[PDB]
Amino acid sequence: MQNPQNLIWIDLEMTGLDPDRDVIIEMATIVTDSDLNTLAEGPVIAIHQPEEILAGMDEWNTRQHGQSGLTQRVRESTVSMAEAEAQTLAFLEQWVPKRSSPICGNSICQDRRFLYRHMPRLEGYFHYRNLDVSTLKELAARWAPQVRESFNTHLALDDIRESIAELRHYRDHFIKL
Amino acid sequence: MQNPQNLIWIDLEMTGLDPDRDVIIEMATIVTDSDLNTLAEGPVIAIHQPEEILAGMDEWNTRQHGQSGLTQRVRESTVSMAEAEAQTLAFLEQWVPKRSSPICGNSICQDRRFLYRHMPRLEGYFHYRNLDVSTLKELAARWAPQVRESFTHLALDDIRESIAELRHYRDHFIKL
């Protein structure tokens, strides 16, 4: 069932932009094979945080997490950061061995940095490689603007599915295979 | 000469890979146009650090920076972290507007970590995205190994190698 060529896709929500001063409040994962076929969708987990952390968010995060329902889900969650990390690792372990997959998604440098601080056991499960779909988004915007225009989610798994679909789009119309 | 499509390529040397423990000791930049033609090579700056910081390096870093001459350059340098950041920003502003170019190069998430901690105004000058050539290398390793297999110790050569690597993928891995 484990395959070292399978890909781990991850997306997080955070209370702010600083991986060391802010925290993770939501995570989700999807596993694909190396040709981007979805093998399994992981758990979507709202991570409990104290009220003062929620009250401390800036105006943008307060509005966005408020109206998406995440703020309420964080208040009501009984899942700690460590429990969410363990739940996600239990899912990924069924599909990918340790240190085999890059971290995959859009601008996943930000996600890796938050994982390194807040979920280091999960961060350490990834290969050191980053697979950043937004690197290809930037190159397509400058070299083939038509490929971008030929391609507005808020739910966690919708966001990851769109990242996978974006890479599939570049593999099909931007990359010479 | 500012152009929002110009790309900023950067290279850093550090005392180690942990921004809480380690500091930047060398930086270099190159600006290209959007089609990877060099517009200008930026300053290569050895950043002064006191002796205790230099003696606190592990075995690999002490030996690599000692043998390369960077340690001695750092010891003699009269440029602080803030002054190196300012000098690099003064160069970049002549070619690229603020928040327009991603950080371009190889293994640049680690670069962004060190800039965020030690040179936050330079870090904020980039777009938040990374243009990391290793994303193309990984995809080529999986989907076209022959292009990856078909493809320097000083800072400007290091950056130029990354530009050439991206050019290689543009010519043989991207269809335009």
UniProtKB/Swiss-Prot annotation, chain A:
SMART domains: EXOIII (SM00479)
Pfam families: RNase_T
A single GO cellular-component term on record: cytoplasm
A biological-process GO annotation: DNA metabolic process
UniProt-listed Enzyme Commission number(s): 3.1.15.-
Enzyme class: hydrolase
Keywords: Cytoplasm, Exonuclease, Hydrolase, Nuclease
Active site: 128
SUPFAM superfamilies per record: Ribonuclease H-like
Domain Exonuclease: 7-167
Highest taxon of the lineage: Bacteria
InterPro entries tied to this protein: Exonuclease_RNaseT/DNA_pol3, Oligoribonuclease, RNaseH-like_sf, RNaseH_sf
Physiological role: 3'-to-5' exoribonuclease specific for small oligoribonucleotides.
PANTHER family in the cross-refs: OLIGORIBONUCLEASE, MITOCHONDRIAL (PTHR11046:SF0)
Family assignment from sequence similarity: Belongs to the oligoribonuclease family.
Protein name in UniProt: Oligoribonuclease
